[PDB]
Design an enzyme around this catalytic site. Structure first.
Site, PDB file in Angstrom:
ATOM      1  N   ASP F  43      -5.632 -10.890  -6.184  1.00 50.27           N
ATOM      2  CA  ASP F  43      -5.270 -10.742  -4.775  1.00 50.27           C
ATOM      3  C   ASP F  43      -5.929  -9.532  -4.111  1.00 50.27           C
ATOM      4  OD1 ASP F  43      -3.508  -9.836  -6.794  1.00 50.27           O
ATOM      5  OD2 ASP F  43      -2.125  -9.098  -5.255  1.00 50.27           O
TER       6      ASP F  43
HETATM    7  C1  8Q1 Z   1       4.017   9.141   0.449  1.00 50.50           C
HETATM    8  C2  8Q1 Z   1       3.997   7.761   1.100  1.00 50.50           C
HETATM    9  C3  8Q1 Z   1       4.895   7.610   2.344  1.00 50.50           C
HETATM   10  C4  8Q1 Z   1       5.676   6.276   2.422  1.00 50.50           C
HETATM   11  C5  8Q1 Z   1       4.941   5.119   3.154  1.00 50.50           C
HETATM   12  C6  8Q1 Z   1       5.847   4.013   3.769  1.00 50.50           C
HETATM   13  C7  8Q1 Z   1       5.206   2.594   3.878  1.00 50.50           C
HETATM   14  C8  8Q1 Z   1       6.200   1.389   3.915  1.00 50.50           C
HETATM   15  C9  8Q1 Z   1       6.623   0.798   2.528  1.00 50.50           C
HETATM   16  C10 8Q1 Z   1       6.729  -0.756   2.471  1.00 50.50           C
HETATM   17  C11 8Q1 Z   1       5.479  -1.547   2.940  1.00 50.50           C
HETATM   18  C12 8Q1 Z   1       5.746  -2.660   3.965  1.00 50.50           C
HETATM   19  O1  8Q1 Z   1       6.663  -2.594   4.740  1.00 50.50           O
HETATM   20  S1  8Q1 Z   1       4.622  -4.129   3.992  1.00 50.50           S
HETATM   21  C13 8Q1 Z   1       4.053  -4.624   5.719  1.00 50.50           C
HETATM   22  C14 8Q1 Z   1       5.004  -5.629   6.410  1.00 50.50           C
HETATM   23  N1  8Q1 Z   1       4.436  -6.957   6.726  1.00 50.50           N
HETATM   24  C15 8Q1 Z   1       3.753  -7.791   5.830  1.00 50.50           C
HETATM   25  O2  8Q1 Z   1       3.592  -7.410   4.671  1.00 50.50           O
HETATM   26  C16 8Q1 Z   1       3.233  -9.143   6.326  1.00 50.50           C
HETATM   27  C17 8Q1 Z   1       2.697 -10.133   5.252  1.00 50.50           C
HETATM   28  N2  8Q1 Z   1       1.429  -9.684   4.662  1.00 50.50           N
HETATM   29  C18 8Q1 Z   1       0.421 -10.571   4.247  1.00 50.50           C
HETATM   30  O3  8Q1 Z   1       0.663 -11.761   4.411  1.00 50.50           O
HETATM   31  C19 8Q1 Z   1      -0.921 -10.046   3.630  1.00 50.50           C
HETATM   32  O4  8Q1 Z   1      -1.443 -11.136   2.949  1.00 50.50           O
HETATM   33  C20 8Q1 Z   1      -0.763  -8.859   2.631  1.00 50.50           C
HETATM   34  C21 8Q1 Z   1       0.694  -8.673   2.235  1.00 50.50           C
HETATM   35  C22 8Q1 Z   1      -1.287  -7.620   3.327  1.00 50.50           C
HETATM   36  C23 8Q1 Z   1      -1.610  -9.095   1.282  1.00 50.50           C
HETATM   37  O5  8Q1 Z   1      -2.803  -9.617   1.544  1.00 50.50           O
HETATM   38  P1  8Q1 Z   1      -3.956 -10.094   0.185  1.00 50.50           P
HETATM   39  O6  8Q1 Z   1      -2.971 -10.223  -0.950  1.00 50.50           O
HETATM   40  O7  8Q1 Z   1      -4.519 -11.367   0.755  1.00 50.50           O
HETATM   41  O8  8Q1 Z   1      -4.910  -8.926   0.087  1.00 50.50           O
END
Ligand code: 8Q1
Ligand code: CDL
Ligand code: CDL
Ligand code: PEE
Ligand code: PEE
Ligand code: PEE
Lengths: 606, 178, 128, 156, 98, 88
Positions: F43
């Site tokens: 992925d």
């Molecule tokens: C020290 C660090 C500080 C903390 C940072 C905080 C960050 C937030 C933590 C949680 C992360 C989120 O919310 S996650 C963001 C919220 N929305 C989504 O995930 C929508 C669905 N994504 C997809 O469909 C894509 O395919 C994808 C998943 C990109 C993969 O793609 P490949 O597989 O085709 O590469």
């Protein structure tokens, strides 16, 4: 003639010979750096003789050799002061410079302009000797500005890098702010005392007023990077590591403390200036140490350490112990230069990496570097019987046994604890644990230049305190009577800092992750002082220099009042005068009006 | 820095950049490798929790809240590679990079040394001269009448052709020029 | 959920916290494509002269010419005396002069009245 | 090579004038925005976002890498202020005013506590240091023809 | 996602050209074609400078008054002067509190 | 002196070493020209971790626009050689 004057003058004179050969066929040869290093070693050996004379009979001298010019009743001549401070500081600086040049022969081996680098280092050493031995204020100013220009040229050594140029100009700016105070002191002393030379100034100022001493204190704050004008020293690590080891750690940055030491007879008499100096030193030595304990670049940690030690020297001056401050200058030079050398060795062995987060277990991979850095940190922490101990531990007692500002005393003790804290941080994150550097290991410290240069300063860091302390005549009244809890306070607070920092560092091994405190953000981002003071005043000044000074005044209103108004008025008058259709019926009637007026206005009253 | 930029970044690109940035800052916070591995696996799980969300409004809102989380939780002193834009060796060797056209101004005594190097340079100069009109012709034919939409350049499509606008890319000084 | 970051003049809002990059219309995408096209044509026009073997000299940049001309020679022809312009000119150009005149005249009047009554301690003041 | 019509002119009163100005400065008419038409002398020059040069992408292939500028693009009126040897407007980890409050509070607190420590000093439970010869009267300046008041120290 | 075929092809041709150029930046074995004591250092860098300075200070600088001024030597009880042969009296019968 | 004159074969060896140390990809199947998606079924998120691992291995940072495209070990080797000016 006794050899004292001849030897003291020759020591400085022979340092200029490799500069006169900068256009010879040695400067285009790869043997020039070794030539410069050999010259500095010979100069150190020669300077060891007047120091022996002083330790024997306390011999001191001033040499006014060249009469430069005479303005009315004021005479300015090239004069050198060869008192205890000069003849003691010259050999220490020469020893450190010899070690650092031998180190730079290895650290800067692949630089295409290493010859230029060596001449530049030599130029700085010459200007520092001029600063240190100066007997009048004009020669002192010559050395003062020479060391600043050499610092500018060496900080921005890699002149294709924007950050290095920004740091060099920052150093110039922050030092000109204190140059204002230097010039104020010169003007006051010339008008009021009618002399720039030290002897006359001492005679005619039995009870010195505030203004010259405040000017001197501003100059010292600028040169030694105290709290108001502190941020330039940490940014000065843009320069190559030997530049940090020589100029910005042990030799050039002590010039403000040296200036206030040179004028200690006048400062003995002004209580307000001593209080201001003590408070400035206390806030500096606490703030910089507080910033140091959360830094990740190793050079930044050592830079904040040296800024905190300069604050401690300023505190020692503020309690009327100038000789103790000079002794701490001489002691601090050894182990601070050697700490910067060890940091440079780590950086070179790790492919120019300076973040401690990528230095793992080097305790066994670089055994000699580990030994040298451990001994240096122990010397810096006031470990008993080491070089650091013969000054710093005497300072802490002196503050404890004085009529002192209470907040300054508390700040000094807390800073003493934080010193051990950040020494622990360096040792823990750089030498203990498991490797965190890239897998292609390049670690190699088996160069004789590196080993010999570090070892020479290692021996000083151990024995110089005892050797020097037992050969200088007593220049104060000792504190023979202390409460026991006040005698052991420096060790107690140092050990407390050691334990607390080590425990908080071992806490980082646990498998917990939490967001940082606001206090951690304040410490790591340097009290937000650069983020505010390098953005708001610069923006407002540079905005007014264009919006009003250039545009509103120069390009608009100054044009509008003098030349544009004149041109508009003359154009209007020309159009009015010349717009006659050429009909004689109009201007012959005009003639009639003119004739009638003349008959009555000028004729009817004769 | 070698690929032409696009008009915008897609949602997938934004979330990937956020993932890399958050992992780097997490590694800055977690100095030790085992602790970093632990919390990086936790971070990957937190990212995978919404891997296949199909509500683009919900995905955008989640990405925005993730950005707000990162900005509050970022390391104020992140680790930077030494030659990266914020690093301690970023532009250190730029003072040593000298353009090759300077070699044209060398005195003939200077060129007397290195005869082979300058013969090879003359061959390179002749090659550059001989293929310029073909490259210009290729660019004009390939590009649209309005102009080029993107900064991407075409390769050489004939046999004895060189890719258009190649001289300054090929004759880069070096990364360690001295 | 977290302490919110608010932008300022000298510390601006980051791109990842900007709600504009999260509410995208087709017109926004069209504008971004147009911007890319403008940048791209300029890049191609620059690289054609840059890579040219025949060219010797400095490539003239009309944007730099416009910047310098606007910063110097276009200012007076576009100036109008307005109450804001008049007030700013009068203040910023006249006020400092009388402020410093008042300060220096007060200081020198004090010094002269001290000299007159023989209380300044001007001893050793040979040079002036 | 630059004609007279390529030079900046007066503020544009009409939309057509704005369209021509935007074309001249190589910008979209939806993006072009002149400075407000007071008598400050800006004229038709475009008002660009007040970002510094440090905020632009360092991984882009700029025509001028050090200045991070592209040949032919409009130049910010205050470019020499923003050249990144100078004023920086990059976003910070702690927001502006958060830093100002902490810094000013720390400095004010240190000043107040230094004043308090001056009011309540620290000292040791001792009397004044005693000096023999009329408190070194002759040594501390002299005036030998005065014979000052005896300062007398007795054993305790 | 990934290189487009034209992008990869252009990268390949540019890479071959760049590698050939970097190979051409190499020097031939002949390429730099150039055209056609024990303790000497301690006398030309120490003895000679100290000869000039000593001559300068002894016979020129000390010709003018007050040019080289030395701190007066310390005198202690019991010292003997080399000029007048005077003997300094001792220090007044110490309390001998031992 | 400083770091040895790193060559093309060394870059390839280190890239394949790092890949073979990845638990997701088996050593026998992996080949220099193997696509990370078609060949290994990986992925986009997984790909980012490989790029970061290569950065940690060679000690330099690859920009995100450049990084996404690299789908084969040969592509990574060519990118690193282009950056470090490696011609053999
Ligand atoms: C020290 C660090 C500080 C903390 C940072 C905080 C960050 C937030 C933590 C949680 C992360 C989120 O919310 S996650 C963001 C919220 N929305 C989504 O995930 C929508 C669905 N994504 C997809 O469909 C894509 O395919 C994808 C998943 C990109 C993969 O793609 P490949 O597989 O085709 O590469
Ligand atoms: C012997 C006789 C005397 C005995 C005294 C009693 C015994 C000792 C008493 C306790 C002393 C303190 C011991 C713990 C220190 C704190 C360490 C810690 O864990 O920090 C937690 C936390 C930060 O942790 P974090 O963010 O989770 O860290 C994340 C990771 O660890 C990030 O990891 P990292 O790798 O970045 O590491 C972070 C770093 C450390 O992280 C930090 O940056 C924060 C550390 C701050 C420590 C500050 C201590 C000294 C402060 C002096 C300040 C003067 C007053 C200033 C007031 C300003 C007000 C504006 O870790 C270290 O490197 C080691 C830290 C230092 C340890 C050793 C400290 C020794 C000196 C202090 C003890 C002195 C003892 C001798 C005294 C003798 C006197 C005679 O900071 C705190 O909460 C406490 C800090 C201490 C001061 C806080 C005061 C509150 C501030 C706001 C008050 C309200 C103001 C209202 C407005 C008023 C306006 C007028
Ligand atoms: C201290 C004692 C008193 C002070 C005396 C000094 C002041 C003299 C004032 C001179 C004013 C004339 C020029 C300025 C304005 C231009 C004329 C005009 O029509 O515009 C008017 C202008 C607006 O009118 P406009 O319709 O919009 O004009 C449109 C165009 O811009 C303009 O339309 P245009 O371009 O078609 O102009 C039409 C035409 C019209 O040109 C004129 O207006 C001629 C005016 C010159 C006559 C000088 C009168 C001064 C008498 C002083 C004697 C003191 C007696 C007590 O222009 C010309 O062709 C002139 C070209 C050159 C021909 C020269 C022929 C004149 C002979 C030279 C002077 C004669 C000297 C007398 C005998 C000499 C023999 C040895 O503003 C006025 O309405 C003001 C009118 C008068 C104001 C005078 C202020 C004096 C205040 C007295 C204060 C006393 C305080 C108490 C004392 C204690
Ligand atoms: C070179 C090698 C020379 C070897 C043979 C020479 C051996 C000794 C020569 C002795 C020459 C005789 C001599 O110098 O006598 C003093 C003679 C004349 O007396 P004055 O002091 O100038 O009279 C007042 C006029 N202003 O002085 C001189 O000519 C020599 C002066 C050289 C001084 C040493 C170098 C210092 C000057 C550096 C320039 C600095 C710029 C200004 C500094 C300002 C300082 C406040
Ligand atoms: C009462 C009588 C007052 C007499 C005082 C005379 C002041 C001396 C300045 C005279 C200069 C007049 C020039 C003038 O007005 O011409 C307007 C002119 C119209 O253009 P033309 O020159 O005709 O050619 C190009 C157009 N096709 O506009 C301009 O271009 C002006 C350019 C020249 C301006 C230079 C003037 C500089 C004066 C500075 C202040 C000193 C002025 C003199 C008096 C000072 C105060 C006592
Ligand atoms: C008497 C005068 C007192 C001083 C009053 C304030 C002086 C204001 C000076 C204005 C100069 C503006 C023009 C400078 C050009 C712009 C510039 O220098 O660039 C800013 C440059 C770059 O930023 P960095 O953080 O270094 O790097 C970031 C890059 N990534 O930073 C700087 O150098 C700015 C320096 C400004 C310093 C102003 C603050 C100092 C004021 C100190 C007052 C307290 C004095 C202490 C007294 C102690 C008692 C003895």
């Amino acid at each position: 003639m006794n050899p004292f004057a001849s030897l003291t003058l020759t020591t400085l004179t022979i340092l200029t010979i490799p500069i006169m050969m900068s256009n010879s066929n040695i400067y285009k040869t790869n043997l020039y750096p070794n030539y410069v290093k050999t010259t500095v070693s010979y100069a150190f050996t020669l300077s060891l003789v007047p120091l022996l004379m002083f330790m024997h009979t306390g011999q001191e001298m001033i040499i006014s050799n060249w009469h430069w010019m005479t303005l009315q009743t004021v005479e300015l001549s090239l004069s050198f002061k060869m008192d205890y401070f000069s003849v003691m500081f010259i050999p220490v600086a020469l020893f450190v410079t010899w070690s650092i040049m031998e180190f730079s022969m290895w650290y800067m081996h692949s630089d295409p302009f290493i010859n230029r680098f060596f001449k530049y280092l030599l130029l700085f050493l010459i200007t520092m000797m001029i600063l240190v031995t100066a007997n009048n204020l004009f020669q002192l100013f010559i050395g003062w500005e020479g060391v600043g220009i050499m610092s500018f040229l060496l900080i921005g050594w890699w002149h294709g890098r924007t950050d290095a140029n920004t740091a060099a100009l920052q150093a110039i700016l922050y030092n000109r702010i204190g140059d204002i105070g230097f010039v104020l002191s010169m003007a006051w002393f010339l008008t009021h005392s009618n002399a720039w030379d030290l002897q006359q100034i001492f005679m005619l100022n039995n009870e010195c007023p505030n203004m010259p001493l405040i000017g001197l204190l501003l100059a010292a704050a600028g040169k030694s990077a105290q709290f108001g004008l502190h941020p330039w020293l940490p940014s000065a690590m843009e320069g190559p590591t030997p530049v940090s080891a020589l100029l910005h750690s042990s030799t050039m940055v002590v010039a403000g403390v040296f200036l206030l030491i040179r004028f200690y007879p006048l400062m003995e008499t002004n209580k307000l200036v001593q209080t201001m100096t003590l408070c400035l030193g206390a806030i500096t030595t606490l703030f910089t140490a507080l910033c140091a304990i959360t830094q990740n670049d190793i050079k930044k940690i050592v830079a904040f350490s040296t800024s905190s030690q300069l604050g401690l020297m300023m505190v020692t001056i503020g309690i009327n112990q100038p000789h103790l401050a000079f002794l701490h200058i001489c002691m601090h030079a050894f182990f601070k230069a050697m700490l910067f050398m060890c940091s440079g060795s780590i950086i070179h062995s790790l492919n120019d990496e300076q973040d401690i987060r990528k230095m793992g277990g080097l305790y066994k991979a670089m055994p000699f570097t580990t030994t040298a850095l451990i001994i240096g940190s122990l010397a810096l922490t006031g470990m008993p019987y080491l070089t650091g101990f013969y000054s710093k531990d005497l300072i802490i007692e002196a503050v404890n046994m004085s009529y002192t500002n209470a907040w300054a005393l508390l700040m000094t003790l807390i800073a003493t604890s934080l010193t051990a804290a950040y020494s622990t941080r360096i040792i823990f994150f750089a030498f203990l644990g498991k490797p965190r550097f890239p897998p292609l290991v390049l670690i190699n410290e088996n160069n004789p230049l590196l080993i010999n240069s570090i070892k020479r300063l290692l021996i000083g860091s151990i024995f110089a305190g005892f050797i020097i302390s037992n050969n200088i005549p007593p220049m104060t009244v000792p504190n023979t009577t202390m409460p026991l809890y006040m005698k052991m306070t420096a060790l107690i607070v140092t050990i407390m800092g050691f334990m607390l920092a080590l425990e908080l560092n071992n806490t980082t091994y646990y498998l917990k992750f939490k967001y940082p405190s606001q206090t951690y953000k304040f410490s790591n981002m340097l009290g937000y002082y650069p983020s505010i003071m390098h953005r708001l005043p610069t923006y407002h000044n540079l905005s007014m220099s264009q919006k009003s000074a250039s545009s509103l005044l120069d390009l608009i209103w100054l044009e509008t009042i003098l030349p544009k108004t004149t041109s508009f008025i003359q154009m209007k008058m020309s159009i009015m005068v010349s717009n006659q259709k050429g009909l004689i019926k109009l201007y012959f009637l005009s003639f009639l009006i003119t004739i009638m007026i003349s008959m009555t206005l000028f004729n009817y009253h004769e | 820095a070698f690929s032409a930029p696009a008009a915008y970044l897609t949602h997938q690109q934004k979330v990937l950049r956020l993932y890399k940035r958050a992992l780097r800052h997490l590694e800055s916070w977690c100095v030790h490798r085992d602790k970093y591995r632990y919390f990086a696996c936790l971070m990957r799980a937190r990212f995978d929790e919404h891997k296949n969300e199909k509500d683009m409004v919900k995905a955008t809102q989640l990405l925005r809240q993730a950005e707000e989380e990162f900005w509050y939780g970022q390391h104020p002193q992140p680790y930077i590679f030494p030659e990266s834009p914020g690093g301690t060796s970023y532009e250190r060797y730029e003072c040593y990079k000298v353009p090759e056209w300077c070699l044209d101004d060398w005195h003939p005594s200077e060129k007397a040394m290195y005869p082979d190097y300058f013969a090879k340079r003359e061959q390179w100069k002749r090659l550059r001269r001989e293929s310029w009109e073909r490259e210009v012709k290729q660019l004009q034919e390939e590009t649209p009448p309005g102009g080029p939409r993107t900064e991407a350049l075409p390769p050489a499509r004939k046999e004895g052709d060189l890719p258009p606008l190649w001289w300054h890319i090929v004759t880069r000084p070096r990364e360690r020029p001295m | 959920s977290f302490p919110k970051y608010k932008p300022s003049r000298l510390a601006t809002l980051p791109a990842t916290l900007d709600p504009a990059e999260y509410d995208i219309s087709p017109e926004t995408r069209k504008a971004q494509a147009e911007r890319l096209a403008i940048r791209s044509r300029l890049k191609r026009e620059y690289l054609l002269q840059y890579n040219d073997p025949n060219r010797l000299g400095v490539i003239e940049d009309p944007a730099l010419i416009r910047w310098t001309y606007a910063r110097s020679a276009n200012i007076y022809p576009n100036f109008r005396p307005t109450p804001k312009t008049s007030l700013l000119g009068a203040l910023f150009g006249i006020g400092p002069l009388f402020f410093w005149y008042y300060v220096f005249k007060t200081d020198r009047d004090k010094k002269e009245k001290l000299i007159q009554e023989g209380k300044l301690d001007q001893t050793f003041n040979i040079s002036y | 090579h630059v004609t007279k019509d390529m030079f900046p002119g007066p503020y544009p009163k009409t939309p057509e004038e704005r369209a021509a100005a935007a074309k001249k400065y190589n910008m979209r008419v939806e993006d072009y925005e002149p400075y407000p038409d007071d008598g400050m002398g800006y004229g038709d020059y475009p008002k660009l976002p007040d970002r510094s040069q440090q905020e632009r992408d360092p991984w882009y292939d700029w025509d001028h890498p050090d200045l991070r500028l592209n040949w032919g693009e409009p130049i910010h009126w205050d470019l020499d202020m923003y050249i990144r040897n100078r004023v920086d407007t990059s976003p910070t980890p702690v927001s502006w005013n958060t830093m100002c409050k902490h810094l000013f509070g720390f400095v004010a607190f240190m000043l107040f506590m230094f004043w308090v420590g001056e009011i309540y000093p620290s000292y040791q439970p001792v009397g004044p240091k005693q000096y023999p010869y009329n408190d070194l009267y002759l040594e501390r300046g002299g005036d030998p023809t005065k014979e000052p008041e005896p300062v007398v120290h007795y054993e305790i | 996602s990934g290189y487009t075929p034209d992008e990869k092809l252009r990268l390949q041709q540019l890479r071959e050209l760049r590698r050939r150029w970097l190979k051409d930046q190499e020097l031939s074995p002949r390429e730099p074609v150039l055209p056609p004591r024990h303790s000497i250092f301690a006398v030309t860098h120490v003895l000679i400078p100290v000869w000039i300075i000593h001559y300068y200070l002894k016979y020129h600088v000390t010709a003018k008054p007050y040019t080289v001024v030395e701190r007066k030597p310390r005198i202690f009880p019991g010292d003997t002067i080399l000029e007048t042969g005077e003997v300094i009296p001792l220090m007044k019968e110490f309390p001998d509190q031992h | 002196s400083d770091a040895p004159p790193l060559t093309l074969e060394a870059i390839k060896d280190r890239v394949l070493y790092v890949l073979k140390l990845y638990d997701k990809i088996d050593p026998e199947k992996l080949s220099v020209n193997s696509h990370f998606m078609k060949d290994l079924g990986l992925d986009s998120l997984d790909q980012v971790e490989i790029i970061m691992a290569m950065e940690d291995e060679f000690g330099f940072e690859i920009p995100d626009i450049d990084a996404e495209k690299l789908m084969c070990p040969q592509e990574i080797v060519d990118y690193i050689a282009d950056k470090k000016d490696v011609y053999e």
